[PDB]
From a paper:
Here, the data collection and structure solution of the N-terminal domain of the ectodomain of HCV E1 from crystals that diffracted very weakly is reported. HCV nE1 is composed of 79 residues and contains no methionines, which makes this construct unsuitable for SeMet phasing. Heavy-atom soaking experiments were attempted but failed to show any useful anomalous signal for substructure determination; therefore, efforts were focused on S-SAD methods. By combining the data from 32 crystals, it was possible to solve the sulfur substructure and calculate initial maps at 7 Å resolution, and after density modication and phase extension using a higher resolution native data set to 3.5 Å resolution model building was achievable. The work reported here shows that useful phasing can be obtained without the need for high-resolution diffraction, or indeed strongly diffracting crystals, if careful data collection is carried out in order to obtain a highly redundant data set from mutiple crystals; indeed, the useful anomalous signal of HCV nE1 crystals did not extend to better than 6.5 Å resolution. The nature of the crystals is also very important; in our case we benefitted from isomorphous crystals, facilitating the scaling and merging of the data, whilst a high solvent content and NCS improved the quality of the early maps.
S-SAD phasing was applied to determine the structure of the N-terminal domain of the ectodomain of Hepatitis C virus envelope glycoprotein E1 (HCV nE1). The HCV envelope glycoproteins E1 and E2 are located on the surface of the virions and are responsible for binding of the virus to the host cells and membrane fusion. Although HCV is a major global health problem, its mechanism of fusion is still not known owing to the lack of structural knowledge of these two glycoproteins.
Residue numbers in the entry:
A (entry chain C): 15 to 52, 68 to 80
B (entry chain A): 0 to 53, 67 to 77
The structure:
Amino acid sequence: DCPNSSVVYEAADAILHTPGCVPCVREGQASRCWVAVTRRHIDLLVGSATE
Amino acid sequence: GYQVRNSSGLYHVTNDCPNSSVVYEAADAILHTPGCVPCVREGQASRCWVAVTPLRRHIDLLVGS
Ligand SMILES: *[C@@H]1O[C@H](CO)[C@@H](O)[C@H](O)[C@H]1NC(C)=O
Ligand SMILES: *[C@@H]1O[C@H](CO)[C@@H](O)[C@H](O)[C@H]1NC(C)=O
């Protein structure tokens, strides 16, 4: 449905299907997280930005 | 934490994941994005731009294996 941006959609889906808490550690503005996929896991760095 | 005074009473709320809030925010924003989130391979990861629901702010993220 949305194939070239899939990797994100997979991650986003894993965050929602995480019943617990996604473990994150803040790196200034951005926070580094480890999302487990239902072994393997997704590494993600998320941050906010303003123009 | 912090308190809330809504229509159903007086409450006290504590975020069980204070550092994980942007992740949940982004995950929601990706699903509410009607188009497709613009990604680019940036190394061994994927650099994406997520527009947040409304000085215009967005969410930058990198996903990897
Ligand atoms: C939140 O981030 C800070 C700074 O990276 C870290 O010291 C702390 O342990 C983190 N807290 C949680 C609940 O993950
Ligand atoms: C009451 O405030 C609390 C905390 O935000 C929430 O659990 C509850 O659903 C709110 N109720 C309404 C009607 O806003």
